[PDB]
Amino acid sequence: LSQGLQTNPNALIYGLQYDVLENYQEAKDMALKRSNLILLAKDRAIIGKKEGEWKKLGDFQHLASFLEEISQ
Amino acid sequence: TQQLSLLKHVLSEDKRPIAFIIAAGCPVSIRHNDAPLIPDVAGLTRKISDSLMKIIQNLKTTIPNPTIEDILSYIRLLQQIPMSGKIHDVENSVINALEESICELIEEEVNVDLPGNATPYHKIAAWINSINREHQVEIFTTNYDLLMEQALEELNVPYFDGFVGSKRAFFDIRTIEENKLPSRWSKLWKLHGSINWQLDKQTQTIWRGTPSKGCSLIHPSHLKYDQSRKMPYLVMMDQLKLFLNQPSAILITCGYSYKDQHINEVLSQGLQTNPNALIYGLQYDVLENYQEAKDMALKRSNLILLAKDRAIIGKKEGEWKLGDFQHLASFLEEISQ
Amino acid sequence: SYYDTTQQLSLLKHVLSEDKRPIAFIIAAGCPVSIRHNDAPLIPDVAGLTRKISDSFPDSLLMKIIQNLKTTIPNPTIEDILSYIRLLQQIPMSGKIHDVENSVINALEESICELIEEEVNVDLPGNATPYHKIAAWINSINREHQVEIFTTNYDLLMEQALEELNVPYFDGFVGSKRAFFDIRTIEENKLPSRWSKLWKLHGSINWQLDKQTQTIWRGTPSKGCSLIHPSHLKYMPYLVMMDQLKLFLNQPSAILITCGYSYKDQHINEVLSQGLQTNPNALIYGLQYDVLENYQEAKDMALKRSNLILLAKDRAIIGKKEGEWKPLFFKLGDFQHLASFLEEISQ
Amino acid sequence: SYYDTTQQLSLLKHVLSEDKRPIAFIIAAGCPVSIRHNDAPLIPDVAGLTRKISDSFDSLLMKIIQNLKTTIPNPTIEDILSYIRLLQQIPMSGKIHDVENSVINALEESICELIEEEVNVDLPGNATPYHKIAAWINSINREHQVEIFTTNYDLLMEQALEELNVPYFDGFVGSKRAFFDIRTIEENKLPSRWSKLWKLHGSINWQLDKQTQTIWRGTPSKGCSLIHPSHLKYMPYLVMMDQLKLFLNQPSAILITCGYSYKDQHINEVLSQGLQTNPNALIYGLQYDVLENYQEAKDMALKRSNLILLAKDRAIIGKKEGEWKPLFFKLGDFQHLASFLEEISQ
Amino acid sequence: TEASTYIGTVQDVNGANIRVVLDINTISSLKFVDGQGYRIGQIGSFVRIPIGYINLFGIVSQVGAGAVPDKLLEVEPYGHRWISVQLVGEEGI
Amino acid sequence: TEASTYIGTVQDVNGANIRVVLDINTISSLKFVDGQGYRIGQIGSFVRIPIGYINLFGIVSQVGAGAVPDKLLEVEPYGHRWISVQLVGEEGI
């Protein structure tokens, strides 16, 4: 995935995390390295290789509900 | 902000042949252990002098504050004459030992590895990767460090530096003139030479490989043009001239002190000959510290100069900005996104 | 029933004098033996390396590995022992088989690699070497499809010969100082028509793995650190070179000449088999230097594949029909005679 | 092992009678020595200039000669001039000869004045061989115009070509200062009628104006000249040699050297490179001496196949040395070559 | 696609004078079949035209601009890749 | 590209009467090779045709409108750049 992200800058990845953002050190390193990868978790939202913060989609049933709402 | 946004669209425009010139001003901009990784020309001269000074002051009598180029050329021309030691002492031994000692000290002082991923060179290489333009972005280097192509290799960026092969890689010449190279492949030329080049006693070869113990080609200026076209200096100069003669529209320089007459003359000739070309040479100092640059700007209208204190546009002096390498790299990275 | 050498040689001359047809080569371990620097050969073959390791490396404990390999297979080679050692190193607590533990096998492998790399890292003799003749032949005709060279060796003799005559080539690695391995430019395949290609199917002594970043690079030949591996099991360039060979064999009207190859390898033989079966326009000249009875696998492949030509020193198998020379003959099998023939046909 | 003169001359006459092939010339110092105005030669050869300098000027001159001879054979004027300019490159160079400098700067000026006053000899009447060559130049309306290269410092070519007014262009454009132009050399967009004459080793009317560091040709001043063989200025030499090299790459190009001794080094190398690059190029080397006196020419002939070297007694053609069939081949002399050209003209 | 021993396709018939257009892309030299070197259409060589189950044999009689049809030269005068084949016999079941 | 001693390409074969089209761009001006000057195809001169490994020699027979094929004249009766070579012998191994 790192090789593909480096080779393809136009493509984007929307990797999620059903946990706290700190449990995935490898994901944090990948987000810091490649900007195209977008990492979102319960703790915060890493956008553009930069750590962000909040001010729901982690649940997979909630993800299916969101997909159904988008389709409908 | 008006000046910056003008070139952003030009860079974003396609069908744009790009080229860069990285002088000694960029390596000084990287600081390791609170000191620059590569000392400037004045720093190099001070370090060499710390470790024969009568000839140095004799040159000072006829010339202003010299740099290591002057001393090296003076030693070479002393060596050229059969017995020229009579000018300063004699013994026909001081010139030699001084030459190899200076070469060894420069070699040991220059060969320093790059620090971590925070180097601006990595940002430049990332931007180079991020563009797939029909015309490759050539890079011109007047330094002796291996920093640039080491950073290129650290991000899997293809480049061609005129040498093809293995441990004893030779200097292919013709493939420069057919210019048949992959579009994604970039070109790297080192105008002043490197610290891994080594000549051959049997014939003029100048092959690139593992850095020889003490033997290196620094400032190639004493070969009498023996075996013409084998000197890497002339072929690189012709490559720059042919690139400038191309109907391109972008050329960016950074860290250039404009203290070399050979580059200045060809730059002026190319800018006069090519009306559609553009030059965005910067300056990390006061605009008045570069008399030659000001004279060229007055004589040549196409050249666009930027300085910390002011900026000259179209041969007309203006009034009050990325002369530093780090700022340029950050701006380029922001433009890439 | 009887094959006469003159017509086969004329056909080979006609084939090698054409420029449109893509050409290739395989230079196996049998070629370096055919040149003598001292009274002994310049570089021994696999058998010489096995003998050197056996008689140079209690001795019973060291030979227990060879006995274990012999218990399942015939007399092993260096490749088998190296593969077994690497497989043992794959399992952490695998030293209980011989009760040797750490650094008893780990350092033994390092010693073996150091010995091999110091023995094979030798300089080429003067300008009469057959490699020089082949390099000169390459520059003879301005071909439109450049000649590729596949090697199964570890040394750098071919690189020295190619650079001595100023023959541009691209072995896969690009760069001046570190020479990072490239994967995009190999498969996009937009290279100058003049540039040649030199693929190493088994790696060389200048290949080093720096770990850490876990990236392969080519550079100066270090001491001890090498990538001698035939196939290895690392988490790969080997598959890339095999794919390159298979892709070349798929080109229309492709010709591939093998000199010094023993056909004892299994992966290469199978790849050549699919390459020949898939494209009926391909061709493989099998040039050996021995009696034909020593190559059973090559005999079976020739009996199975029609467009494969096998020419031994006493017999020949052309078009699924074994025969005999009509007055050993066909001295072209040896690499010296092949180089002399190439330099003769060059001018 | 044997050659006949008549077939070689017939081949050369066939070659010169084709207008499709571009033609050029090399007029070295061996041509002026072939014409006698007074009892003395009109212009002495390089040995003559060396002897005249030796007997005309003393201790420091002999010291310089000894220093150069310590590692080099019998010198020339170019050698001593290059040595003087190399010394001038170093500021504190006066200690080599223990002369404290500032004297060599006047000695070189004196030598330049002597040479420039000696070479100004003027041309005799309309019977000169150069007049015949000029008449042959414009005789035929060739579609590719003939270029001329000269290593001579004098102006015999100019006087001869202007006495029979012919199209001419030497690179300098202008009427008062005649500023040297570079662009018009490079586009090569000139009408075919205009002839091209180029001086590789520099003339005597060339003056370096300094100041803005610009070059200009015109009236010859006193003492101020640009006789430099090659010089090492930070240039006409490089671009003009590039022009010669570009000419040698033209398809089916013929170049004839008359009175050339092949003792130069850069010229030989550029000629060899041009011969190797394009196999269709062809060079006629014409000499007036024993073939054994040209070692570099022998090496070039044995190396480059398409170079034809013809001497008085022996001739090497196609990497095979031979001898004339019963000295012969008087075409080496400039007078005989001029008579040949003027008789083939009509 | 096309099997080995392929030369071209028939483009004109005049009773007993067939005209064939060579469909080989290039390199009309030593088309190897069954490990033996045969040459592309030559004056003294034979050709085979299979029709379903029986094979018609023929012999080349003319190669080059002579075998080009009537008005093909008029349409283009620089195209010459035709051969003229004359039937000889056939092989039955 | 095309080396020296090059004249043209074969465009017709009738057993032992070859027809060649001159590729020289009207440069029949004593072509030079190996320090000597030969003349582009002449009535009494020899030509060489290399087939892979062996060279087929021949002697020119007729030069001009005669060598043009039968109907190429009917197409363009103003283009005369053909020669008619008759094969003589060959060199073996």
Q: Cβ–Cβ of D234/B80 closer than 8 Å?
A: no
Instruction: Give Cβ neighbours of residue D42 (< 8 Å, ≥ 6 apart).
Output: D32, D33, D35, D36, D121, D124
Q: Cβ–Cβ of C11/E30 closer than 8 Å?
A: yes
**DSSP 8-state symbol, F4:** S
Q: Please identify which residue in the block is written with the tokens 């490649």.
A: A34
- Cβ of residue C9 closer than 8 Å to a chain B Cβ: no
Distances (CA, A) of C114 to B203, B286, C78, C107: 34, 59, 14, 10
Whether B323 contacts B307, CB under 8 Å: yes
Whether D53 contacts D78, CB under 8 Å: no
| Three-class secondary structure assignment of chain D | CEECHHHHHHHHHHHHCCCCCCEEEEECCCCHHHCECCCCECCCCHHHHHHHHHHHCCHHHHHHHHHHHCCCCCCCHHHHHHHHHHHHHCCCCCCCCCCCCCCHHHHHHHHHHHHHHHHCCCCCCCCCHHHHHHHHHCCCCCCCCCEEEECCCCCHHHHHHHHCCCCCCCCEECCCCCEECCHHHHHCCCCCCCCEEEECCCCCCEEECCCCCCEEECCCCCCCCCCCCCCCCCCHHHHHHHHHHHHHCCCCCEEEEECCCCCCCHHHHHHHHHHHHCCCCEEEEECCCCHHHCHHHHHHHHHCCCEEEECCCEEEECCCEEEECCCCCHHHCHHHHHHHHHHHHC
Instruction: Give Cβ neighbours of residue C120 (< 8 Å, ≥ 6 apart).
Output: C43, C154, C155, C205
Instruction: Give Cβ neighbours of residue C226 (< 8 Å, ≥ 6 apart).
Output: C113, C116, C117, C205, C207, C208
> How far apart (Å, rounded) are the C-alpha atoms in residues D19 and D254?
11
Please give the residue of chain C at the shortest CA–CA distance from B154.
C180
Q: In this complex, which of F13, F52, F75 lies closest to E63 when CB atoms are compared?
A: F13
- Cβ of residue A6 closer than 8 Å to a chain B Cβ: yes
Residue A58, φ and ψ in degrees, nearest 5: -60, -35
**DSSP 8-state symbol, A48:** T
Find the length of chain E: 93
Pairing of strands C321-325, C2-3: parallel
Q: Please identify which residue in the block is written with the tokens 């594949």.
A: C305
Instruction: Give Cβ neighbours of residue D80 (< 8 Å, ≥ 6 apart).
Output: D53, D64, D65, D68
- Cβ of residue B272 closer than 8 Å to a chain D Cβ: no
Provide, as residue numbers in chain C, all residues whose Cβ is less than 8 Å from the Cβ of E39. none
Q: In this complex, which of D11, D280, D305 lies closest to F37 when CB atoms are compared?
A: D11
Distances (CA, A) of D346 to B137, B186, D132, D138, D164: 60, 60, 12, 12, 17
Q: In this complex, which of B62, B82, B87 lies closest to D71 when CB atoms are compared?
A: B82
Please give the residue of chain C at the shortest CA–CA distance from E3.
C280
Angle at which helix C267-278 crosses helix C237-249, to 10 degrees, equals: 30
Long-range contacts of B209-218 (CB under 8 A, 24+ apart): B209/B167, B209/B168, B209/B169, B209/C220, B210/B167, B210/C219, B210/C220, B211/B107, B211/B111, B214/B100, B214/B103, B214/B104, B214/B107, B215/B103, B216/B103, B216/B107, B217/B193, B218/B72, B218/B103, B218/B106, B218/B144, B218/B192, B218/B193
Judging contact as 3 or more Cβ pairs under 8 Å, the answer for F and D is yes
Q: Please identify which residue in the block is written with the tokens 């590209």.
A: F1
> How far apart (Å, rounded) are the C-alpha atoms in residues F13 and F19?
7
Which parts of chain B are beta strand (E)?
A: 19-22, 31-32, 35-36, 138-141, 159-160, 168-169, 186-190, 197-198, 207-209, 252-254, 304-306, 311-313, 316-317
E49, β-bridge pairs: E56
Instruction: Give Cβ neighbours of residue C187 (< 8 Å, ≥ 6 apart).
Output: none
> How far apart (Å, rounded) are the C-alpha atoms in residues F63 and B249?
57
Q: In this complex, which of D20, D280, D318 lies closest to F36 when CB atoms are compared?
A: D318
Instruction: Give Cβ neighbours of residue D234 (< 8 Å, ≥ 6 apart).
Output: B261, B262, B265
Whether C307 contacts E35, CB under 8 Å: yes
Residue whose C-alpha is closest to residue B305's, from B332, B336, B275, B278: B278
Chain F positions contacting chain C at CB under 8 Å are 52-53, 93
Residue whose C-alpha is closest to residue D338's, from D131, D45, D124, D29: D131
**DSSP 8-state symbol, B134:** S
Q: Cβ–Cβ of D318/F4 closer than 8 Å?
A: no
Which amino acid is residue F68, in one-letter code? Answer: V
**Residue F59 DSSP SS3:** strand
| Strands across the sheet containing A16-17 | A16-17, A39-41, A45-47, A50-51
> How far apart (Å, rounded) are the C-alpha atoms in residues B167 and C176?
10
Find the length of chain D: 346
Q: Cβ–Cβ of E35/C318 closer than 8 Å?
A: yes
> How far apart (Å, rounded) are the C-alpha atoms in residues B249 and B17?
7
Q: Cβ–Cβ of B86/D95 closer than 8 Å?
A: yes
Q: Which two tokens stand for residue C108?
A: 């033994």
Residue whose C-alpha is closest to residue D77's, from D102, D111, D110: D111
Find the length of chain A: 72
Burial category of B297 from C-beta neighbours within 10 Å (exposed 0-12, middle 13-18, buried 19 and up):
buried
Judging contact as 3 or more Cβ pairs under 8 Å, the answer for B and C is yes
> How far apart (Å, rounded) are the C-alpha atoms in residues C249 and E16?
42
Whether B142 contacts B21, CB under 8 Å: yes
Breaks (C-N over 2.5 A) in chain C follow: 57, 235, 327
Residue whose C-alpha is closest to residue D342's, from D126, D35, D144, D29: D126
Distances (CA, A) of B13 to B8, B134, B184, D81: 9, 12, 18, 56
C283, β-bridge pairs: C255
Would the CA dihedral through B122, B125, B129, B131 be positive or negative?
Answer: positive
Whether F57 contacts F48, CB under 8 Å: yes
Q: Cβ–Cβ of E26/C20 closer than 8 Å?
A: yes
Q: Which two tokens stand for residue B246?
A: 């191309």
Residue C14, min C-alpha distance to chain F (Å): 5
Residue B122, φ and ψ in degrees, nearest 5: -65, -40
Whether A6 contacts A34, CB under 8 Å: yes
**DSSP 8-state symbol, B4:** H
Q: Which two tokens stand for residue F33?
A: 């090779």
Q: Which two tokens stand for residue B94?
A: 């001081």
- Residue C138: count of CB within 10 angstroms of its CB: 22
D3, β-bridge pairs: D324
Burial category of C121 from C-beta neighbours within 10 Å (exposed 0-12, middle 13-18, buried 19 and up):
middle
Residue whose C-alpha is closest to residue C186's, from C199, C176, C177: C199
Q: Which two tokens stand for residue B48?
A: 């060499």
Breaks (C-N over 2.5 A) in chain B follow: 51, 320
| Three-class secondary structure assignment of chain C | CEECHHHHHHHHHHHHCCCCCCCCEEECCCCHHHCECCCCECCCCHHHHHHHHHHHCCHHHHHHHHHHHHHHCCCCCHHHHHHHHHHHHHCCCCHHHCCCCCCCCHHHHHHHHHHHHHHHCCCCCCCCCHHHHHHHHHCCCCCCCCCEEEECCCCCHHHHHHHHCCCCEECCECCCCCCEECCHHHHHCCCCCCCEEEEECCCCCCEEECCCCCCEEECCCCCCCCCCCCCCCCCCHHHHHHHHHHHHHCCCCCEEEEECCCCCCCHHHHHHHHHHHHCCCCEEEEECCCCHHHCHHHHHHHHHCCCEEEECCCEEEECCEEEEECCCCCHHHCHHHHHHHHHHHHC
- Cβ of residue B86 closer than 8 Å to a chain D Cβ: yes
- Residue E77: count of CB within 10 angstroms of its CB: 17
Whether B276 contacts B245, CB under 8 Å: no
Q: How far is CA B50 from the centre of its chain?
A: 26
Interface test with E, best of F71, F78, F80, F85 (most E CBs within 10 A): F71
> How far apart (Å, rounded) are the C-alpha atoms in residues C115 and B52?
50
Residue D199, φ and ψ in degrees, nearest 5: -105, 110
DSSP assignments along E22-84, one per residue: E---S--S-EEETTEEEPSS-TT-EEEEEETTEEEEEEEEEEETTTS-TTHHHH-SS---EEE
**Residue B326 DSSP SS3:** helix
D122, β-bridge pairs: none
Q: Cβ–Cβ of F52/C17 closer than 8 Å?
A: yes
- Residue B176: count of CB within 10 angstroms of its CB: 19
What percentage of chain F's residues is helix, strand, coil (to nearest 5)?
10, 45, 50
Q: Cβ–Cβ of E80/F11 closer than 8 Å?
A: yes
Residue C76, min C-alpha distance to chain E (Å): 35
> How far apart (Å, rounded) are the C-alpha atoms in residues B174 and B197?
19
Q: How many angstroms separate the first and last alpha carbons of chain D? A: 35
Distances (CA, A) of C347 to C136, C137, F79: 10, 9, 38
Q: How far is CA A12 from the centre of its chain?
A: 10
Q: Please identify which residue in the block is written with the tokens 């560091």.
A: D213
Q: Cβ–Cβ of A6/B129 closer than 8 Å?
A: yes
Q: Cβ–Cβ of B86/D92 closer than 8 Å?
A: no
Q: For chain A, what is the largest distance between any 2 Cα atoms, rounded to a whole number of angstroms?
A: 37
> How far apart (Å, rounded) are the C-alpha atoms in residues E24 and E40?
9
Q: How far is CA C63 from the centre of its chain?
A: 28
**DSSP 8-state symbol, F54:** E
DSSP assignments along B79-125, one per residue: HHSTT-GGGS--TTTHHHHHHHHHHHHHHHHH-----STT-HHHHHH
- Resolution of the coordinates in A? 3.3
Q: How many angstroms separate the first and last alpha carbons of chain C? A: 34
Q: In this complex, which of D14, D252, D308 lies closest to F35 when CB atoms are compared?
A: D308
Residue A27, min C-alpha distance to chain B (Å): 18
> How far apart (Å, rounded) are the C-alpha atoms in residues D313 and D310?
9
- Cβ of residue C20 closer than 8 Å to a chain E Cβ: yes
DSSP assignments along B210-258, one per residue: S--SS----S---STT-STT-SHHHHHHHHHHHHHHS-----EEES---
- Residue A5: count of CB within 10 angstroms of its CB: 17
Whether A27 contacts A39, CB under 8 Å: yes
Pairing of strands D254-258, D282-286: parallel
- Cβ of residue C151 closer than 8 Å to a chain B Cβ: no
Q: Cβ–Cβ of D90/B84 closer than 8 Å?
A: yes
Buried b (16+ CB within 10 A) or exposed e, D96-122: bbebebeebeeebeebbeebbebbeee
- Residue C75: count of CB within 10 angstroms of its CB: 10
Q: Which two tokens stand for residue C103?
A: 């650094």
Q: Which two tokens stand for residue C45?
A: 């073959």
Rg over CA atoms, chain A: 13
Distances (CA, A) of E16 to B6, E7, E49, E61, E88: 78, 19, 13, 12, 9
H or E segment to which residue F37 belongs: strand F36-37
- Cβ of residue D280 closer than 8 Å to a chain F Cβ: yes
Q: Which two tokens stand for residue B20?
A: 């860069």
Whether D286 contacts D258, CB under 8 Å: yes
**Residue B292 DSSP SS3:** helix
Provide, as residue numbers in chain B, all residues whose Cβ is less than 8 Å from the Cβ of A9. 130
Provide, as residue numbers in chain D, all residues whose Cβ is less than 8 Å from the Cβ of F25. none
Q: Please identify which residue in the block is written with the tokens 């395989």.
A: C26
Q: Which two tokens stand for residue F31?
A: 């072509």
Buried b (16+ CB within 10 A) or exposed e, E17-28: ebbbbbeeeeee
Whether A16 contacts A58, CB under 8 Å: yes
Buried b (16+ CB within 10 A) or exposed e, D27-51: bbbbbbbbbeeeeeebbbbbebbbe
F30 backbone φψ class: left, alpha, beta (φ>0; ψ -120 to 50):
left
Q: Cβ–Cβ of B86/D71 closer than 8 Å?
A: no
Residue D148, min C-alpha distance to chain F (Å): 23
Whether D245 contacts D147, CB under 8 Å: no
Q: Which two tokens stand for residue D129?
A: 């061989």
Q: How far is CA C170 from the centre of its chain?
A: 17
Side-chain half-sphere of D206: how many Cα atoms within 13 Å? 22
Instruction: Give Cβ neighbours of residue B127 (< 8 Å, ≥ 6 apart).
Output: B332, B333, B335, B336
